[PDB]
Design a protein around this ligand. Structure first.
Ligand code: A1CL4
Length: 166
């Protein structure tokens, strides 16, 4: 958890313009959050990038978790190995509002972060899930009570989030 170069937005939310894969490889945090789907199929976005950085070890483990436990619920999570990226990966399912899933479940999704004192994470439901990323940061700030270090890849999005916040 030796994070560096973050800007503190609130007592417990920090942000950096960084690639979450590179941050995980540098810091090897106790927990890295994945922006997952209910079947843990890590096909694109942050999920595809974290799985690729494990050379598909994350996907093989996830398929076994699903065969034994069934799919997650939207707003839910599971804890699996972080492989080379972290001690643990917290796979969290935010709603895909582009498919009619309820935006209220974004609060439920962020509540899962409270089971861990420190996390490295992306914004949930941003990208292909369709939620406005600045709304997702507001829900994170209003819901997460533990220490969360948010990595945002895109510089234009990062500058917009920092300006809206501070
Ligand atoms: O943080 C961003 O800029 C966002 C996304 C993203 C998408 C793909 C990524 N592939 C590798 C590492 C980080 C990634 C991050 C999806 C929406 C917002």
């Amino acid at each position: 958890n030796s994070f560096s170069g973050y800007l503190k937005l609130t007592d417990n939310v920090y942000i950096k313009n960084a690639d979450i894969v590179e941050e995980a490889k540098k810091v090897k945090p106790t927990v890295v959050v994945n922006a997952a789907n209910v079947y843990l199929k890590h096909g694109g976005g942050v999920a595809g990038a974290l799985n690729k950085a494990t050379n598909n070890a994350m996907q093989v483990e996830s398929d076994d978790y699903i065969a034994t436990n069934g799919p997650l619920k939207v707003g839910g999570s599971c804890v699996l190995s972080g492989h080379n990226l972290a001690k643990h990966c917290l796979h969290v399912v935010g709603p895909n509002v582009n498919k009619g899933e309820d935006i209220q479940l974004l609060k439920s999704a962020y509540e899962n972060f409270n089971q861990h004192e420190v996390l490295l994470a992306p914004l949930l439901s941003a990208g292909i899930f369709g939620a406005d990323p600045i709304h997702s940061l507001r829900v994170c700030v209003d819901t997460v009570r533990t220490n969360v270090y948010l990595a945002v890849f895109d510089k234009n999005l990062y500058d917009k989030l920092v300006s809206s916040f501070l």
